[PDB]
Amino acid sequence: RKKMGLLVMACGTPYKEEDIERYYTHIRRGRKPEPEMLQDLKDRYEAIGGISPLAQITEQQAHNLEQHLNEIQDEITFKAYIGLKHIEPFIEDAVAEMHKDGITEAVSIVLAPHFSTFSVQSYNKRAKEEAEKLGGLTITSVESWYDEPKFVTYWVDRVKETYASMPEDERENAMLIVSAHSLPEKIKEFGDPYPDQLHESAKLIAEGAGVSEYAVGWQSEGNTPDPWLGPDVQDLTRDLFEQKGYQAFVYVPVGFVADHLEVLYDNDYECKVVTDDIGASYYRPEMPNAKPEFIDALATVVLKKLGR
Numbered sequence: 001r002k003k004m005g006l007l008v009m010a011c012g013t014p015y016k017e018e019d020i021e022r023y024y025t026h027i028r029r030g031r032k033p034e035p036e037m038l039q040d041l042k043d044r045y046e047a048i049g050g051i052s053p054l055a056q057i058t059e060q061q062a063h064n065l066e067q068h069l070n071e072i073q074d075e076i077t078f079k080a081y082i083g084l085k086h087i088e089p090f091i092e093d094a095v096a097e098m099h100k101d102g103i104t105e106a107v108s109i110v111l112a113p114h115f116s117t118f119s120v121q122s123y124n125k126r127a128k129e130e131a132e133k134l135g136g137l138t139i140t141s142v143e144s145w146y147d148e149p150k151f152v153t154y155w156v157d158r159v160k161e162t163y164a165s166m167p168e169d170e171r172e173n174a175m176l177i178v179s180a181h182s183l184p185e186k187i188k189e190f191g192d193p194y195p196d197q198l199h200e201s202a203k204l205i206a207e208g209a210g211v212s213e214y215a216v217g218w219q220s221e222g223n224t225p226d227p228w229l230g231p232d233v234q235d236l237t238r239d240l241f242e243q244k245g246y247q248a249f250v251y252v253p254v255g256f257v258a259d260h261l262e263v264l265y266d267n268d269y270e271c272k273v274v275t276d277d278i279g280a281s282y283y284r285p286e287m288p289n290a291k292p293e294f295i296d297a298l299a300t301v302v303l304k305k306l307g308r
């Protein structure tokens with residue numbers, strides 16, 4: 001069998017409370033969070049059940065993906081390597097370990113289904129530049145996979161279950177909000193297809209689920225002076241309610257693939273704050289995490305990228 005590195009990339013999460021400072025310092029481009037912000041972040045991680053389970057999920061996704069890929073075909077033996085953006089093991093650490101282990105050929109995938117120049121493209125550029133610095137190693141990189149039918153089907157089935165679980169009047173008066181992580185609006189000056197891909201995710205999921213009333217929103221924007229992609233899910237929820245009085249809101253943060261603060265808090269608390277305030281029911285179906293259906297979707301994405 002041909003041996004191939006499987007480079008699984010993701011944002012990264014702190015591994016313990018004491019990593020919060022350095023993690024967010026990395027996110028803030030060297031700017032250490034002020035003490036009140038550090039304390040608030042600790043409170044938030046404690047409120048959603050703790051950091052450790054969150055940090056486990058990328059590991060489980062990569063290892064299940066490796067094993068499942070090695071099981072469903074017989075030509076390639078994959079070895080998974082995790083490269084993270086904002087905490088060790090960094091992308092360059094992962095590429096360097098692949099080089100050390102004798103890997104000469106690798107396929108990479110970012111655990112984010114939509115391409116953007118800010119995230120996926122930069123992950124891929126960092127991996128490929130480390131590989132070319134070290135030499136003797138090439139990487140073929142998945143760039144987007146939001147339209148993989150098995151992944152669409154994951155979210156379609158979750159949405160169908162959520163709508164079927166509703167009371168009749170909720171089911172008749174509900175709103176589906178499909179969201180991804182906001183980015184600076186300036187990405188549009190490069191023709192970044194990220195917004196169009198999020199809209200396409202929302203179209204495909206709503207269509208598959210039979211949900212005719214849905215909206216596209218953004219979440220987790222930063223505070224840079226430049227405008228970020230909007231509307232934010234909080235404002236969009238309040239605004240849609242003020243237009244049409246929906247009694248239930250279903251949040252599908254399709255841009256995220258795992259439980260993390262920006263879902264468990266930014267949706268299950270902040271959006272929940274808004275729905276509770278307007279008297280609407282809140283629903284947020286399970287994130288893919290390392291569930292077998294999602295891992296099979298990722299394995300299909302990888303094998304298709306390799307033309308197998």
Ligand SMILES: *Cc1c(C)c(=O)n2c(=O)c(C)c(C)n12
Nearest residue numbers: 011012027112119181182255
């Ligand atoms: C950490 C992280 C995740 C998971 C994600 O989707 N995004 C973004 O879009 C940014 C900008 C960052 C950071 N992250």
Ligand SMILES: [Mg+2]
Nearest residue numbers: 016017018019
């Ligand atoms: Mg301790």
Ligand SMILES: [Mg+2]
Nearest residue numbers: 143144145147
């Ligand atoms: Mg494509």
Ligand SMILES: [Mg+2]
Nearest residue numbers: 219220221266
């Ligand atoms: Mg926020």
Ligand SMILES: [Zn+2]
Nearest residue numbers: 011027085086
């Ligand atoms: Zn980032």
Ligand SMILES: [Zn+2]
Nearest residue numbers: 059063080082
């Ligand atoms: Zn591992």
Ligand SMILES: [Zn+2]
Nearest residue numbers: 067068069071
């Ligand atoms: Zn399997």
Ligand SMILES: [Zn+2]
Nearest residue numbers: 099100134135
């Ligand atoms: Zn070397």
Ligand SMILES: [Zn+2]
Nearest residue numbers: 199215216217
């Ligand atoms: Zn739109």
Ligand SMILES: [Zn+2]
Nearest residue numbers: 181220221262
């Ligand atoms: Zn963020």
